[PDB]
C-alpha cells in the first residue's frame, strides 16, 4: 500500500526502488496578452526520479516542444511522466530495475500503472509523506541544465554528492529533505545559508558545497531554525 | 403457455418466478406454476423461510424441455429436474391443473417488463456462463464467484462472465496508454464487440443476465460485471447510436424494476455518477438519467 512514517526505513533496505516526482514536468509563466487576456507560456521542466538508497537521480528534461499542439497539458504531463519512467525502466538491465516505484502525487498512480502493465511485478505505490521534491529546481545546477536544454535529454546526477562515504542513506536522505524543505519555505534564506561563506565551494562534479562534518551540523541547525522561523512568520507564533 | 410442476413443497419457502414471488407454507398443497409465457427465458428462485442465507434458483426455457421441481431432503433444496418422458409429463401436469393446486404466472397484458429485462438473454449463452452441460437449465445462487473473482476458488461452480479489466494489456494498446485508458472505444468496439461478443446483442445479453443475477440472488460478482459493462460503454467516446439508445432502454427498465430498499447496495455510486455526469455518454442516457434522478437522487 502507501508509504508513511511507519514503514520509513523501507526506503533504505536493499530492494531497488525509485521515487517519481512530476511537479516540475509541466511549467508555465502566466502573462497578459495585448488584448488584455491571460495566456500561459510553457518553460522547460523535468521528471525527478530518485533512488533514495544510492542517491542516483535520473533527471529527464522535459523540453517545451513536447507540448506543442497538445491540449489538456496538466493531464498529458502525468501520462508523459509515466511514459518516460516506463522507458527508463526498460532501458535498465533487469537486475537494475526497481522492485517498487513510489509516486509523490496520487494522480500519477493510474498513468504509471498503465504504462507499467508489462512489469506486473513492479509495485506502484503512493505515499502519505509531504516530500519537498518540488524544490529541486532550487538547486542551481539542476535548474541550469533544465533551462539550457534545447531538446529532450536525460541527465544523471548523484543528489547526495559524496555524502555516502561518511553517512548512511537514512541520514543522507534526511539531510536532503531538510535542505529541500528549507529551500521550499524560504529559498533566498536557504541559499544565503548554504553560500554565505565563500571559502566552502561546490565541486564541479557536485551539487552542494563541500562541508565538513562539523559544518554540516551547523548548516543543518540553521535550516531547522529557518523552517521553524518561517512557520512563525507565516502563522504568527 | 407452459408449466413447471412441483412434486411437493415440504419446507416453507418464498418462491420467485421472474419478477414475481409468493409464499408457500410448510407442506402446503402447492404443485407448481402454470401459464408461463413461452418465448422468453425464465428464472425460478427460492429463499427458505428458516434460513434466508443463500437465495438460489434455476434459469430455464420451456421450449428446451419439460422441467419440474422436487425437494431433495438430503441436499436441502428445491431441485430442478428434466422429465424425458413427455407422455408421463403431460399426464402429471393435467391432473394438478384439474385440481387447481398451481399458481398462474400473473402476466398483466400491458406489461412488457420481463421482455425488456431479458430482451437479449439467450439460454444458450447462459449455459456458457454457468457451466453444467448435462442439464438444460442453469443453477445460480448468492455465493457463486466469478472467473475474475477467483483470479483475484472452485472453477466448476463459477460464473464465467467475460473478464473486463480497464488496466489490463487486453484493454490497452502499446503506445496508446493515455488514449485507450481515457477513451475505451478500442477495448469496447474492437476487443469486446468484434473480438469476443461478435455483436452488441450478446454483450447486452450478458449485461442483462449479470443484472438479474445481482438483483435476484444478491450475487456481488454479477453486480460487478453489470457495472463494468455499463462503464465500458459510458467511457467510450465512439459508440454506435443504436447501442446507446438501446443501452438507455435496458438500464431504464433495470432501474425501474430494482427494489427501492435494495438500491443502496445494488447501485455503485461512483459508476453511476461518472456514467451519468462525467463520461463521454453523460448526455446520451436520457431515460436512464431521468428515472435515476427522480427515484434515487440520494445516490447522486
Ligand atoms: N451488503 C452488501 C454488499 C453487496 C451485496 C450484494 C450485492 Br448484489 C452487492 C453488494 N457487499 C457487502 C460486502 N461484500 C459482500 C456484499
Curated annotation (Swiss-Prot), chain A:
Changing residue 21 to N: Reduced growth at 30 degrees Celsius. Strongly reduced growth at 16 degrees Celsius. Changing residue 22 to N: Reduced growth at 30 degrees Celsius. Strongly reduced growth at 16 degrees Celsius. Changing residue 21 to A: Alters protein folding. Severely impaired growth. Strongly reduced growth at 35 degrees Celsius. It is found in: Nucleus. It comes from the Eukaryota. Changing residue 105 to K: Severely impaired growth. Reduced growth at 30 degrees Celsius. Strongly reduced growth at 16 degrees Celsius. Residues 7-237 are annotated as: RNase H homology domain. Changing residue 22 to A: Reduced growth at 30 degrees Celsius. Strongly reduced growth at 16 degrees Celsius. Strongly reduced growth at 35 degrees Celsius. Functions as a scaffold that mediates the ordered assembly of spliceosomal proteins and snRNAs. Required for association of BRR2 with the spliceosomal U5 snRNP, and the subsequent assembly of the U4/U6-U5 tri-snRNP complex. Functions as a scaffold that positions spliceosomal U2, U5 and U6 snRNAs at splice sites on pre-mRNA substrates, so that splicing can occur. Interacts with both the 5' and the 3' splice site, as well as the branch region. Has a role in branch site-3' splice site selection. Associates with the branch site-3' splice 3'-exon region. Also has a role in cell cycle. Component of the U4/U6-U5 tri-snRNP complex composed of the U4, U6 and U5 snRNAs and at least PRP3, PRP4, PRP6, PRP8, PRP18, PRP31, PRP38, SNU13, SNU23, SNU66, SNU114, SPP381, SMB1, SMD1, SMD2, SMD3, SMX2, SMX3, LSM2, LSM3, LSM4, LSM5, LSM6, LSM7, LSM8, BRR2 and DIB1. The MPN (JAB/Mov34) domain has structural similarity with deubiquitinating enzymes, but lacks the residues that would bind the catalytic metal ion. Present with 468 molecules/cell in log phase SD medium. This is Pre-mRNA-splicing factor 8. It comes from Saccharomyces cerevisiae (strain ATCC 204508 / S288c) (Baker's yeast). The chain holds residues 1836 to 2069 of 2413 of the full protein.
Curated annotation (Swiss-Prot), chain B:
Residues 244-265 are annotated as: Leucine-zipper. InterPro entries: AAR2 (IPR007946), AAR2_C (IPR033648), AAR2_C_sf (IPR038514), Aar2_N (IPR033647), AAR2_N_sf (IPR038516). Changing residue 236 to A: No effect on interaction with PRP8. One of its GO terms (biological process) is spliceosomal snRNP assembly. It is found in: Cytoplasm; Nucleus. The modification Phosphoserine is found at residue 236. CDD domains: Aar2_C (cd13778), Aar2_N (cd13777). The keyword Phosphoprotein applies. The modification Phosphothreonine is found at residue 257. Disulfide bonds: none annotated. Its main location: cytoplasm. GO terms for cellular component: cytoplasm; U5 snRNP. It comes from the Eukaryota. Phosphorylated on serine and tyrosine residues. The keyword Nucleus applies. Heterodimer. Interacts with PRP8 (via RNase H homology domain and MPN domain), competing with BRR2 for the same binding site. Component of a U5 snRNP complex that contains at least the U5 snRNA, PRP8, SNU114, AAR2, SMB1, SMD1, SMD2, SMD3, SME1, SMX2 and SMX3, but is not a component of the U4/U6-U5 tri-snRNP complex. Component of the U5 snRNP complex that is required for spliceosome assembly and for pre-mRNA splicing. Involved in splicing pre-mRNA of the A1 cistron and other genes that are important for cell growth. Present with 7330 molecules/cell in log phase SD medium. This is A1 cistron-splicing factor AAR2. It comes from Saccharomyces cerevisiae (strain ATCC 204508 / S288c) (Baker's yeast).
Amino acid at each position: 500500500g502507501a508509504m508513511n512514517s511507519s514503514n520509513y526505513a523501507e526506503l533504505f533496505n536493499n530492494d531497488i526502488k525509485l521515487f517519481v516526482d512530476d511537479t516540475n514536468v509541466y511549467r508555465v509563466t502566466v502573462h497578459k496578452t495585448f488584448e488584455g487576456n491571460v495566456a500561459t507560456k510553457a518553460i522547460n521542466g523535468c521528471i525527478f526520479t530518485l533512488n533514495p538508497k544510492t542517491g542516483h537521480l535520473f533527471l529527464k528534461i522535459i523540453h517545451t516542444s513536447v507540448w506543442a499542439g497538445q491540449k489538456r497539458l496538466s493531464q498529458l504531463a502525468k501520462w508523459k511522466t509515466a511514459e518516460e519512467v516506463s522507458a527508463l525502466v526498460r532501458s535498465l538491465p533487469k537486475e537494475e530495475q526497481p522492485k517498487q516505484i513510489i509516486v509523490t502525487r496520487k494522480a500519477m498512480l493510474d498513468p504509471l500503472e498503465v504504462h507499467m502493465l508489462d512489469f506486473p511485478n513492479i509495485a506502484i505505490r503512493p505515499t502519505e509523506l509531504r516530500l519537498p521534491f518540488s524544490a529541486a529546481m532550487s538547486i542551481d545546477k539542476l535548474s541550469d541544465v533544465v533551462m539550457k536544454a534545447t531538446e529532450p535529454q536525460m541527465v544523471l546526477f548523484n543528489i547526495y554528492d559524496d555524502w555516502l562515504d561518511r553517512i548512511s542513506s537514512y541520514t543522507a536522505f534526511s539531510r536532503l529533505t531538510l535542505l529541500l524543505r528549507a529551500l521550499k519555505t524560504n529559498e533566498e534564506s536557504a541559499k544565503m545559508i548554504l553560500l554565505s561563506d565563500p571559502t566552502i565551494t561546490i565541486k564541479s562534479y557536485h551539487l552542494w558545497p563541500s562541508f565538513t562534518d562539523e559544518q554540516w551540523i551547523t548548516i543543518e541547525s540553521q535550516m531547522r531554525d529557518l523552517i521553524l522561523t518561517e512557520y512563525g512568520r507565516k502563522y504568527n507564533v | 403457455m407452459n408449466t413447471v410442476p412441483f412434486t411437493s413443497a415440504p419446507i416453507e419457502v418464498t418462491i420467485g418466478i421472474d419478477q414475481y414471488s409468493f409464499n408457500v407454507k410448510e407442506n402446503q398443497p402447492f404443485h407448481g406454476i402454470k401459464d408461463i409465457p413461452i418465448g422468453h427465458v425464465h428464472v425460478i428462485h427460492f429463499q427458505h423461510a428458516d434460513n434466508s442465507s443463500m437465495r438460489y434458483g434455476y434459469w430455464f426455457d420451456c421450449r428446451m424441455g419439460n422441467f419440474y421441481i422436487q425437494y431433495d431432503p438430503k441436499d436441502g433444496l428445491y431441485k430442478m429436474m428434466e422429465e424425458r418422458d413427455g407422455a408421463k409429463f403431460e399426464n402429471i401436469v393435467h391432473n394438478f391443473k384439474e385440481r387447481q393446486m398451481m399458481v398462474s404466472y400473473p402476466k398483466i397484458d400491458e406489461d412488457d417488463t420481463w421482455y425488456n429485462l431479458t430482451e437479449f438473454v439467450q439460454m444458450d449463452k447462459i449455459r456458457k456462463i454457468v457451466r453444467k452441460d448435462e442439464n438444460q437449465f442453469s443453477y445460480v445462487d448468492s455465493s457463486m464467484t466469478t472467473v475474475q473473482e477467483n483470479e483475484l476458488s472452485d472453477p466448476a461452480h463459477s460464473l464465467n462472465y467475460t473478464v473486463i479489466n480497464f488496466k489490463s494489456r487486453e484493454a490497452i494498446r502499446p503506445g496508446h496508454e493515455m488514449e485507450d485508458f481515457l477513451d475505451k472505444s478500442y477495448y469496447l468496439n474492437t476487443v469486446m464487440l468484434q473480438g469476443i461478443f461478435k455483436n452488441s446483442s450478446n454483450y447486452f445479453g450478458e449485461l442483462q443476465f449479470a443484472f438479474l443475477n445481482a438483483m435476484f440472488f444478491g450475487n456481488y460478482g454479477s453486480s460487478l460485471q453489470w457495472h463494468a459493462m455499463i462503464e465500458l460503454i459510458c467511457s467510450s467516446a465512439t459508440v454506435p447510436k443504436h447501442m446507446l439508445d438501446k443501452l438507455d432502454e435496458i438500464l431504464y427498465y433495470q432501474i425501474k424494476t430494482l427494489p427501492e430498499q435494495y438500491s443502496d447496495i445494488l447501485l455503485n455510486e461512483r459508476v453511476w455518477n461518472i456514467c451519468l455526469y462525467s463520461s463521454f455518454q453523460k448526455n446520451s442516457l436520457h431515460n436512464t438519467e431521468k428515472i435515476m434522478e427522480n427515484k434515487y437522487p440520494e445516490l447522486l
